[PDB]
């Protein structure tokens, strides 16, 4: 969309691969305020709003928090306090044509500066001076929208640049889009520290024959102690038992008699620690 008529999209209820865009280096400008891309992946957000518009390379400077520009004032305004990522990649190859693409328009002059995150579609002849425009072309009366030349050989400052700005909104209580979670490999038959769907624990995982229900994730025995969990990847049920623990007792015939001692590990099969079970 044109810069004055910037197009906003709403993205939610999904997993957002912020790393993929961050890892890609094609984009000329990646200015993120109040958030880091690596932090974005772990973070959770209620709703992102992506604004897509084509502007000159010079005007890429204007579209930033705390930046004053004619394009910023009359086309798209960015709040200073706002936290988001501004992404700009050169579009001179595709947008530009030998004749020149003048379809992209921008508001040269407007009666008032646009409020933050506000889009104006008004097409009325701007009125300069005391004399009224009357909606007709005249001296001091000009159409606000102005075309972009966007010639193929145009200077890089004037070259068309496609800019998308991401607006992370945490106002709404659930972080529906939020972000992705990369899962480590599964290991069983060894006492490990596990974190399943935010449920943390320590123990040894093993195959289980008990049958859950399709909607049912984990289980607890009497006294509300976890006994089995479903791993979300392969829809399998795994039994959880705490790894061996117990007391160690020393059997001695008395220092007065001898120096040798024996060690008893209580309730711990010691195949994994003259051994008698």
């Amino acid at each position: 969309a044109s810069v004055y008529a910037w197009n906003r999209k709403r993205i939610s209820n999904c997993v957002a691969d912020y790393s993929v865009l961050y890892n890609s280096a094609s984009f000329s400008t990646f200015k993120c305020y109040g958030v880091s891309p690596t932090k974005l992946n772990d973070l959770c957000f209620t709703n992102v709003y992506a604004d897509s518009f084509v502007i000159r390379g010079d005007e890429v400077r204007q579209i930033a928090p705390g930046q004053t520009g004619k394009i910023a004032d009359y086309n798209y305004k960015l709040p200073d306090d706002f936290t988001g990522c501004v992404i700009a990649w050169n579009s001179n190859n595709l947008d530009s044509k030998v004749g020149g693409n003048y379809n992209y328009l921008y508001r040269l002059f407007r009666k008032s500066n646009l409020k933050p995150f506000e889009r104006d579609i008004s097409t009325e002849i701007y009125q300069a001076g005391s004399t009224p425009c009357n909606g007709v072309e005249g001296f001091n009366c000009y159409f606000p929208l102005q075309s972009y030349g966007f010639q193929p050989t145009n200077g890089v400052g004037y070259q068309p640049y496609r800019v998308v700005v991401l607006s992370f909104e945490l106002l709404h209580a659930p972080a529906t889009v939020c972000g992705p979670k990369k899962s480590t490999n599964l290991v069983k038959n060894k006492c490990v520290n596990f974190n399943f769907n935010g449920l943390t624990g320590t123990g040894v995982l093993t195959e289980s024959n008990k049958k859950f229900l399709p909607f049912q994730q984990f289980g607890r025995d009497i006294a509300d102690t976890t006994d089995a969990v479903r791993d979300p990847q392969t829809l399998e049920i795994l039994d959880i038992t705490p790894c061996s623990f117990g007391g160690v007792s020393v059997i001695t015939p008395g220092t007065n008699t001898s120096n040798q001692v024996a060690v008893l590990y209580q309730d711990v099969n010691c195949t994994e620690v003259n051994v008698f079970q």
Partner: nanobody
Framework: QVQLVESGGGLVQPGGSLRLSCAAS????????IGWFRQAPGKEREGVSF????????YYVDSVKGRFTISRDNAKNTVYLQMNSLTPEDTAIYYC????????????????????????WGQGTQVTVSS
Amino acid sequence: QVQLVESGGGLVQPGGSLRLSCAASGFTLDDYAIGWFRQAPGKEREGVSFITSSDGSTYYVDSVKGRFTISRDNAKNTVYLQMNSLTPEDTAIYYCAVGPSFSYTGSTYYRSELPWDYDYWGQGTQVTVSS
């Protein structure tokens, strides 16, 4: 005021290693974004490498990926860009640029090869690579 001084440069052999030091006066190096830009003759300057974040995370342009490494020393208030495998295409004048300060802007991550984004510009030093 902010003043940037560029040191290094000059003619080097193909594949040579050369380091450019950007001296910083009047501002803290860590807080402000640091961008090394290359301007070819007759062409607009473009940023080869950037210090994206205050903690020191860095991004490198595909052309200079691996070949160019940028390091910031706060104690000595200087940013050094090390160039390796230098080539005649690489030959151009290199400018040290100061981006907006991370703390004031609130920008954790900031990388921009477009020159207008960086508020302050160093004079720059010519780096030439020839057989």
